[PDB]
Amino acid sequence: VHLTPEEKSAVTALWGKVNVDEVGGEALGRLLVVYPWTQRFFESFGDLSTPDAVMGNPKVKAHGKKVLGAFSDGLAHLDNLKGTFATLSELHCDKLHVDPENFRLLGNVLVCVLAHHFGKEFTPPVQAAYQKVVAGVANALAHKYH
Amino acid sequence: VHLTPEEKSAVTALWGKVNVDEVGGEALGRLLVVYPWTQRFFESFGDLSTPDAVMGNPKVKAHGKKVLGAFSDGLAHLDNLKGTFATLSELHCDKLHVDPENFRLLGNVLVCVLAHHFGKEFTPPVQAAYQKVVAGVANALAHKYH
Amino acid sequence: VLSPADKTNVKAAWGKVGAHAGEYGAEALERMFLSFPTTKTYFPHFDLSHGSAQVKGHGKKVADALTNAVAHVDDMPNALSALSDLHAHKLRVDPVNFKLLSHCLLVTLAAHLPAEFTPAVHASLDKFLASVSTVLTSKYR
Amino acid sequence: VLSPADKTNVKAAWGKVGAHAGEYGAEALERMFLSFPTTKTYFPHFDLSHGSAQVKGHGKKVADALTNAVAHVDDMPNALSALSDLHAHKLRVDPVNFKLLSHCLLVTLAAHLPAEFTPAVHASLDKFLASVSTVLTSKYR
Numbered sequence: 001v002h003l004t005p006e007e008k009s010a011v012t013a014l015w016g017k018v019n020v021d022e023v024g025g026e027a028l029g030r031l032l033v034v035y036p037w038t039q040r041f042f043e044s045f046g047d048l049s050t051p052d053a054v055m056g057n058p059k060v061k062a063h064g065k066k067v068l069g070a071f072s073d074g075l076a077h078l079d080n081l082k083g084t085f086a087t088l089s090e091l092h093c094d095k096l097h098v099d100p101e102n103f104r105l106l107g108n109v110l111v112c113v114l115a116h117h118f119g120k121e122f123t124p125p126v127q128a129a130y131q132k133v134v135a136g137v138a139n140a141l142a143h144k145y146h
Numbered sequence: 147v148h149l150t151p152e153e154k155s156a157v158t159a160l161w162g163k164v165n166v167d168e169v170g171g172e173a174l175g176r177l178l179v180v181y182p183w184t185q186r187f188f189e190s191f192g193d194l195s196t197p198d199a200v201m202g203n204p205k206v207k208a209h210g211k212k213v214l215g216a217f218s219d220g221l222a223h224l225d226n227l228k229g230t231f232a233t234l235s236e237l238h239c240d241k242l243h244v245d246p247e248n249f250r251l252l253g254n255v256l257v258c259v260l261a262h263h264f265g266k267e268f269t270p271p272v273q274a275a276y277q278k279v280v281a282g283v284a285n286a287l288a289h290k291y292h
Numbered sequence: 293v294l295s296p297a298d299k300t301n302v303k304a305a306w307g308k309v310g311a312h313a314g315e316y317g318a319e320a321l322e323r324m325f326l327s328f329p330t331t332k333t334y335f336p337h338f339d340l341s342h343g344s345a346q347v348k349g350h351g352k353k354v355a356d357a358l359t360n361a362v363a364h365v366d367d368m369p370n371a372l373s374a375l376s377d378l379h380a381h382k383l384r385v386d387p388v389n390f391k392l393l394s395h396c397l398l399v400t401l402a403a404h405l406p407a408e409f410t411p412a413v414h415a416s417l418d419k420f421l422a423s424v425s426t427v428l429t430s431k432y433r
Numbered sequence: 434v435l436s437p438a439d440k441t442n443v444k445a446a447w448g449k450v451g452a453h454a455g456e457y458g459a460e461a462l463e464r465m466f467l468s469f470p471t472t473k474t475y476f477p478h479f480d481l482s483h484g485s486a487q488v489k490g491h492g493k494k495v496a497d498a499l500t501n502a503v504a505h506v507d508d509m510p511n512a513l514s515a516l517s518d519l520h521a522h523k524l525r526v527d528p529v530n531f532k533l534l535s536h537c538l539l540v541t542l543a544a545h546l547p548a549e550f551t552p553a554v555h556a557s558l559d560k561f562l563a564s565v566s567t568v569l570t571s572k573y574r
């Protein structure tokens with residue numbers, strides 16, 4: 001990650017516009033629809049009889065604040081991602097061992113949740129300055145893999 | 147990359163055992179056989195009528211010292227890869243724009259050239275300490291992409 | 293290829309789109325091009341910037357394929373066989389962008405109507421591309 | 434699936450191997466397992482370390498498939514249909530390792546006879562896996 005306080009203050013200010021209070025739970029419930037084959041790791045959620053059983057799950061709501069939360073932690077300290085993502089990566093590498101070909105997706109899904117609930121802000125400069133930012137997380141949770 | 151002078155001195159000492167004087171040219175001529183679809187970037191070599199035309203090309207011989215050379219540069223200064231790979235990545239990103247799904251291969255091919263010409267040294271500890279090492283290059287030439 | 297309700301979700305999304313498909317198809321281009329990170333050196337040859345009737349002329353080609361595809365989706369691999377010949381036997385383009393234009397439709401239509409909020413639509417335009425992506429690079433048995 | 438000389442290079446490599454195939458198949462496992470980076474937490478359930486007749490018992494399963502495959506290679510998708518059911522409908526293993534066991538054969542046979550130095554053999558065991566990898570995960574039309 002590496003942007004100027006001007007282009008970063010926008011993708012960073014969108015945090016308020018985003019109700020992380022739950023928007024983090026809808027981001028995962030969607031990643032499953034566009035990619036439900038990941039039923040190997042989400043096997044813990046148990047409740048998964050039908051796509052609707054996911055949004056009805058109580059953990060997905062609280063678990064959403066954890067996923068979208070780790071992201072807000074970076075914007076709150078981009079001084080070093082691998083520094084804080086040292087546990088998530090180690091916990092996601094040896095504990096969950098999530099294939100590295102997945103984060104690149106959760107990044108294209110969340111963005112869609114913003115352009116939809118906030119399309120009046122998907123300005124060109126706000127998007128380009130949105131990939132290289134979270135793009136560091138995709139690798140952060142993969143820097144401990146190799 | 148990050149190994150101990152003991153496990154690193156072995157994968158690093160193998161350099162001498164490797165005749166980079168040409169072994170770097172055979173590493174590419176092979177990457178094409180196992181993956182000849184990359185005929186979009188190697189379109190410059192021109193000479194490519196048949197797989198044998200690749201080993202008969204004079205540049206592949208001198209170009210091999212450049213590819214295997216950039217690698218030796220790291221072992222000669224692992225203090226910072228992105229520091230030296232700043233040009234190769236920028237030159238390979240905007241000038242060549244090589245897809246990021248390729249380095250992971252050149253790393254599995256070269257190793258085969260050693261286990262073959264030097265299988266009496268492919269000891270277990272010499273291999274495990276061979277991936278995380280060059281694994282940094284695969285990302286180095288991709289850190290400027292995102 | 294395809295057959296299950298996977299289409300009902302596509303024909304549905306195509307119902308709200310209607311005479312507005314060739315439009316969202318153009319906004320899907322400026323979606324990934326705006327970042328113009330790698331393609332910048334590729335220079336598609338059609339001014340990805342505005343003031344280029346060529347960019348909007350390309351979108352209609354994407355929304356026209358999905359329609360011409362929904363028009364058959366049971367024999368489109370032959371009609372869309374040319375696209376695979378222009379992207380595979382010409383331009384040597386790198387399908388690696390397919391992952392971009394694929395999500396672009398979801399981020400570009402967002403400014404209007406993206407998925408629709410159906411536990412399946414999001415996968416409709418994302419997976420239905422499986423039949424459009426396979427015909428774009430048919431291995432030709 | 435497959436048909437061109439792509440096999441002649443496989444049957445050839447299988448000719449030098451001979452009663453030594455089930456052997457190189459076992460060394461292909463300790464090849465990627467030695468690093469045991471991710472699988473470490475997966476615990477395959479067969480002691481990847483030596484002193485485990487289970488590791489050498491698995492190699493023979495890989496060299497036995499290529500043979501049983503060369504034994505038909507014109508109808509193996511049904512005989513190897515079980516493997517796809519054990520790796521897809523059971524164990525939920527992550528084929529992401531296929532990229533490891535694939536090169537392992539080339540790095541493990543190196544200690545003896547890997548490619549053979551033929552501008553095509555290197556692709557034979559690497560591409561011929563295309564028919565072994567497709568039957569290992571047949572999408573079942």
Ligand code: HEM
Nearest residue numbers: 038041042044066067068070071088096098102103106137
């Ligand atoms: C790449 C963006 C992602 C981020 C930032 C992220 C972040 C997190 C965080 C912070 C936790 C909580 C860790 C804890 O409980 O201490 C977590 C748990 C979890 N994540 Fe993710 N995650 C991401 C993607 C994924 C993906 C793609 C999957 C697979 C669909 C996944 C599956 C899980 C699972 C199963 C847990 C629960 C593990 C447990 O119960 O301990 N995550 N994730």
Ligand code: HEM
Nearest residue numbers: 184187188190212213214216217234242244248249252283
């Ligand atoms: C991932 C390991 C690789 C390394 C370390 C590497 C390194 C290099 C270096 C040092 C050069 C010379 C740059 C110069 O001329 O100033 C070069 C050139 C080149 N490489 Fe690679 N390379 C790698 C992989 C590849 C791959 C996979 C391809 C595609 C098959 C490729 C295609 C080329 C081409 C076409 C050139 C010539 C560009 C020119 O003429 O300026 N390289 N590479």
Ligand code: HEM
Nearest residue numbers: 336353354356357358375378385389390393421424425428
């Ligand atoms: C499933 C996604 C896609 C669909 C449905 C699609 C469809 C089409 C169609 C219908 C045309 C018109 C062909 C003609 O002129 O007769 C076209 C042209 C073109 N497409 Fe795509 N396309 C897709 C993805 C892409 C991607 C990812 C790229 C690369 C960024 C791309 C680059 C082009 C180019 C350069 C042309 C112009 C070719 C010419 O000059 O005739 N397309 N596409």
Ligand code: HEM
Nearest residue numbers: 477494495497498499516519526530531534562565566569
């Ligand atoms: C084309 C490459 C591969 C071939 C040809 C192959 C072939 C086989 C065969 C023939 C068996 C015996 C099935 C039986 O017990 O009846 C087997 C079992 C097994 N394979 Fe593979 N395999 C391949 C790759 C892999 C990979 C990448 C993994 C994961 C590291 C894997 C994991 C296993 C496991 C766990 C078993 C034991 C299943 C059991 O308990 O019955 N295989 N494989």
